[PDB]
Design an enzyme around this catalytic site. Structure first.
Site, PDB file in Angstrom:
ATOM      1  N   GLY A   1      43.018  40.473  29.999  1.00  0.00           N
ATOM      2  CA  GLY A   1      42.183  41.684  30.080  1.00  0.00           C
ATOM      3  C   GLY A   1      42.113  42.468  31.391  1.00  0.00           C
TER       4      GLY A   1
ATOM      5  N   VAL B   1      39.783  45.349  33.468  1.00  0.00           N
ATOM      6  CA  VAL B   1      38.335  45.572  33.488  1.00  0.00           C
ATOM      7  C   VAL B   1      37.988  46.949  34.014  1.00  0.00           C
ATOM      8  CG1 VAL B   1      36.067  44.724  34.115  1.00  0.00           C
ATOM      9  CG2 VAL B   1      37.896  43.096  33.842  1.00  0.00           C
TER      10      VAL B   1
ATOM     11  N   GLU C   1      26.956  43.814  32.139  1.00  0.00           N
ATOM     12  CA  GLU C   1      26.346  44.506  33.261  1.00  0.00           C
ATOM     13  C   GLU C   1      27.425  44.737  34.313  1.00  0.00           C
ATOM     14  OE1 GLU C   1      23.732  41.792  35.236  1.00  0.00           O
ATOM     15  OE2 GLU C   1      23.142  43.192  36.768  1.00  0.00           O
TER      16      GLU C   1
ATOM     17  N   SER D   1      33.879  40.928  42.384  1.00  0.00           N
ATOM     18  CA  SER D   1      33.993  39.474  42.556  1.00  0.00           C
ATOM     19  C   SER D   1      34.115  39.061  44.008  1.00  0.00           C
ATOM     20  CB  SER D   1      35.226  38.958  41.809  1.00  0.00           C
ATOM     21  OG  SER D   1      36.467  39.339  42.408  1.00  0.00           O
ATOM     22  N   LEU D   2      33.602  37.871  44.320  1.00  0.00           N
ATOM     23  CA  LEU D   2      33.802  37.196  45.612  1.00  0.00           C
ATOM     24  C   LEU D   2      35.264  37.127  45.990  1.00  0.00           C
ATOM     25  CD1 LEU D   2      31.339  34.137  45.611  1.00  0.00           C
ATOM     26  CD2 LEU D   2      31.098  36.414  46.705  1.00  0.00           C
TER      27      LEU D   2
ATOM     28  N   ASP E   1      35.884  27.935  33.667  1.00  0.00           N
ATOM     29  CA  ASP E   1      36.642  28.922  34.422  1.00  0.00           C
ATOM     30  C   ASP E   1      35.883  29.408  35.674  1.00  0.00           C
ATOM     31  OD1 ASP E   1      38.895  30.445  34.981  1.00  0.00           O
ATOM     32  OD2 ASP E   1      38.278  32.107  33.679  1.00  0.00           O
TER      33      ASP E   1
ATOM     34  N   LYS F   1      35.696  30.117  39.530  1.00  0.00           N
ATOM     35  CA  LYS F   1      36.585  30.519  40.629  1.00  0.00           C
ATOM     36  C   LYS F   1      36.029  31.767  41.290  1.00  0.00           C
ATOM     37  CE  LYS F   1      39.487  32.523  37.143  1.00  0.00           C
ATOM     38  NZ  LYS F   1      40.768  32.318  36.390  1.00  0.00           N
TER      39      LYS F   1
ATOM     40  N   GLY G   1      33.388  33.201  28.650  1.00  0.00           N
ATOM     41  CA  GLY G   1      33.930  33.534  27.321  1.00  0.00           C
ATOM     42  C   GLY G   1      35.006  32.661  26.700  1.00  0.00           C
ATOM     43  N   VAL G   2      34.643  32.013  25.582  1.00  0.00           N
ATOM     44  CA  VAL G   2      35.517  31.093  24.828  1.00  0.00           C
ATOM     45  C   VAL G   2      35.777  31.577  23.396  1.00  0.00           C
TER      46      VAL G   2
HETATM   47  N1  LIG Z   1      31.091  42.773  35.035  1.00  0.00           N
HETATM   48  C1  LIG Z   1      31.861  43.155  36.079  1.00  0.00           C
HETATM   49  N2  LIG Z   1      31.405  44.003  37.029  1.00  0.00           N
HETATM   50  C2  LIG Z   1      32.187  44.383  38.055  1.00  0.00           C
HETATM   51  N3  LIG Z   1      33.460  43.959  38.221  1.00  0.00           N
HETATM   52  C3  LIG Z   1      34.028  43.099  37.334  1.00  0.00           C
HETATM   53  C4  LIG Z   1      33.235  42.646  36.192  1.00  0.00           C
HETATM   54  N4  LIG Z   1      34.019  41.833  35.486  1.00  0.00           N
HETATM   55  C5  LIG Z   1      35.226  41.767  36.103  1.00  0.00           C
HETATM   56  N5  LIG Z   1      35.219  42.526  37.196  1.00  0.00           N
HETATM   57  C6  LIG Z   1      36.313  42.659  38.149  1.00  0.00           C
HETATM   58  O1  LIG Z   1      37.503  42.657  37.410  1.00  0.00           O
HETATM   59  C7  LIG Z   1      38.404  41.723  37.984  1.00  0.00           C
HETATM   60  C8  LIG Z   1      39.237  41.103  36.856  1.00  0.00           C
HETATM   61  O2  LIG Z   1      38.434  40.293  36.012  1.00  0.00           O
HETATM   62  P1  LIG Z   1      39.124  39.304  34.943  1.00  0.00           P
HETATM   63  O3  LIG Z   1      39.931  40.089  33.953  1.00  0.00           O
HETATM   64  O4  LIG Z   1      38.129  38.268  34.428  1.00  0.00           O
HETATM   65  O5  LIG Z   1      40.215  38.583  35.871  1.00  0.00           O
HETATM   66  P2  LIG Z   1      40.141  37.064  36.415  1.00  0.00           P
HETATM   67  O6  LIG Z   1      38.745  36.537  36.670  1.00  0.00           O
HETATM   68  O7  LIG Z   1      41.063  37.161  37.610  1.00  0.00           O
HETATM   69  N6  LIG Z   1      40.863  36.111  35.169  1.00  0.00           N
HETATM   70  P3  LIG Z   1      39.789  35.383  34.007  1.00  0.00           P
HETATM   71  O8  LIG Z   1      40.183  33.943  34.307  1.00  0.00           O
HETATM   72  O9  LIG Z   1      40.288  35.967  32.680  1.00  0.00           O
HETATM   73  O10 LIG Z   1      38.356  35.806  34.321  1.00  0.00           O
HETATM   74  C9  LIG Z   1      37.581  40.721  38.790  1.00  0.00           C
HETATM   75  O11 LIG Z   1      38.174  40.523  40.074  1.00  0.00           O
HETATM   76  C10 LIG Z   1      36.257  41.393  39.002  1.00  0.00           C
HETATM   77  O12 LIG Z   1      36.097  41.726  40.371  1.00  0.00           O
END
Ligand SMILES: Nc1ncnc2c1ncn2[C@@H]1O[C@H](COP(=O)(O)OP(=O)(O)NP(=O)(O)O)[C@@H](O)[C@H]1O
Ligand SMILES: Nc1ncnc2c1ncn2[C@@H]1O[C@H](COP(=O)(O)OP(=O)(O)NP(=O)(O)O)[C@@H](O)[C@H]1O
Ligand SMILES: [Mg+2]
Lengths: 297, 311
Positions: A42, A44, A106, A112-113, A152, A154, A172-173
């Site tokens: 995905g 985002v 939200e 992300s960190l 998950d 990290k 999410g599962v």
């Molecule tokens: N609710 C949110 N609000 C703001 N930023 C987000 C949110 N969700 C995801 N992101 C940003 O989108 C980026 C990609 O998220 P995601 O697709 O989950 O990749 P991932 O954590 O690297 N792989 P996964 O193991 O699928 O979660 C992350 O680095 C977040 O910083």
């Protein structure tokens, strides 16, 4: 200790009413704004839900898989509407459309960190203390209250905002020759994930393999995933380097990173660890640190 | 477990035949015939024109976003460039037309599940030599950390008319599952070593597979719903019920009287339910059955050719 602080319950109700203002979700009720990042699977996006005028993050996972597995996922994702903690990203809905399952949550203005790490170099100890607490509370909430584990943890799944909240997302599962010992990971696994994430952010380098003291002074003063995956299993765990962190923190990561899951620390053992009681004590202008790091404001 | 002037010369002569391919392109291959199938792809015997080499070519029909593509192939190359007389030789990999193509040494014997069909049963001394080559094979992957990507079953043991026996190519599925489940571009994983040593193959689950496969081949049937008194006197003189039966009810074992005790013991050691109790390649490498096998002078090529019709 853990029970909703009065100012936290004031934000959880704040959310839940705005979520009541939403109802049911479908592709056309949405307009993209910005890409917030992606990973394996995905992408985002920052999006606005026109019926409600609310700004959301939308994860767009790509399926193109058997409808039986699909409806079943959407079915079991619904449980997240009862997942309501200050330490979990606010959930809105989850639906199918377009050949792509999407998860609306939200939006977090700090991301992300993982992204915070890229701007900061290192995240300092007392900030990491507040992180530690958050994920512990969010694991415990999910564990004891929904018998869910995260599976998950990290840095990319630890989200932060300008209000100085830290929340978990991405909850999410007749012929087989598999081992019985294989034909049958815990919250204990999630803790290893925490610990390792803690080291990464602390030193600003993914700690596997460790570095020799040559690359370390350039900090304090190239392998395939299968090599990696093997190293993790066979070689001793990584540690914080000494001198530059408190003993209480050095120890806290160690109890999370004991190779043997049985001897490794559990949520309740950690919730009272020296480093956490001290961390919970401290007043830390996390918000201050976060905005300055990334530029907000 | 090191020394042979011949083993060294054939592996050397493979490496010499190797680079004569140069770069491998889709055009360079004439599909001679088909060879078999797994859960991976379909394999064809092929001629390679730029060198007149006969090759096995395994086609994996999974599409990969062009961005990460060269990175996944390098990984797959590093993984697949072994050098063991117990592992089929590796010529190269590439990606043309929505398809990964692993190219390998052709094993003119085919696989053991195939050989099992033509033989009905495989006799003890043959299985002795298969047992050796498998054990040798796993050990070399232990001593190279490639184990996690290698299962054992009769379809993954190839044989040839020069009497050789080898484990095959890696299940590329597992590499890609791993790549998506972790940070493929940063090369970082956040998984516990439990969860990792738990969702991948290991030597101790391989040894179970081997022993299970040795029983299958020896009795002429998948043995996990066990043969009762009826069938084990005819021979000689449900989907989730399986995985339930494997964990619940007691292990399978070779019929008495018709297999040696040394053999009987050896499968048993391979098939104790607890992976810690169950033997490893240092115990098995000095088990009565293996020292006897290794001593015996077995015309495997003769038997194999006769079994399947070559020359
Ligand atoms: N609710 C949110 N609000 C703001 N930023 C987000 C949110 N969700 C995801 N992101 C940003 O989108 C980026 C990609 O998220 P995601 O697709 O989950 O990749 P991932 O954590 O690297 N792989 P996964 O193991 O699928 O979660 C992350 O680095 C977040 O910083
Ligand atoms: N080098 C080779 N020479 C001759 N036959 C081969 C060769 N490689 C594979 N085969 C045949 O083709 C089949 C291909 O399946 P295999 O290589 O096991 O697929 P896989 O993806 O590696 N593992 P699995 O998919 O679980 O069977 C084998 O069972 C053999 O019969
Ligand atoms: Mg994420």
């Amino acid at each position: 200790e853990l029970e909703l602080d009065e100012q936290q319950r004031k934000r959880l109700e704040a959310f839940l009413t705005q979520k009541q203002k939403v109802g049911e979700l479908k592709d056309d009720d949405f307009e993209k704004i910005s890409e917030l990042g992606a990973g394996n699977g995905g992408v985002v996006f920052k999006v606005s839900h026109k019926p409600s005028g609310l700004v959301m993050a939308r994860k767009l996972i790509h399926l193109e898989i058997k409808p039986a597995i699909r409806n079943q996922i959407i079915r079991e994702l619904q449980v997240l509407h009862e997942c309501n903690s200050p330490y979990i990203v606010g959930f809105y809905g989850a639906f199918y459309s377009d050949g792509e399952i999407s998860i609306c949550m939200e939006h977090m203005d700090g991301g992300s960190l993982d992204q915070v790490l890229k701007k900061a170099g290192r995240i300092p100890e007392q900030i990491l203390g507040k992180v530690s607490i958050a994920v512990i509370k969010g694991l415990t909430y999910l564990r004891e209250k929904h018998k869910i584990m995260h599976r998950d943890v990290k840095p990319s799944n630890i989200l932060v905002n300008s209000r100085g909240e830290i929340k978990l997302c991405d909850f999410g599962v007749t012929r087989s020759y598999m081992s019985p010992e294989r034909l049958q990971y815990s919250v204990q696994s999630d803790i290893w994930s925490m610990g390792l994430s803690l080291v990464e952010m602390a030193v600003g380098r993914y700690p596997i393999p460790p570095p020799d003291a040559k690359e370390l002074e350039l900090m304090f003063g190239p392998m395939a995933i299968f090599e990696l995956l093997d190293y993790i299993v066979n070689e001793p765990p990584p540690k914080l380097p000494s001198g530059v962190f408190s003993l209480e923190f050095q120890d806290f990561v160690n109890k999370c990173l004991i190779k043997n899951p049985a001897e490794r620390a559990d949520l309740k053992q950690l919730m009272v660890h020296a480093f956490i009681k001290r961390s919970d004590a401290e007043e830390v202008d996390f918000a201050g640190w976060l905005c300055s790091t990334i530029g907000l404001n």
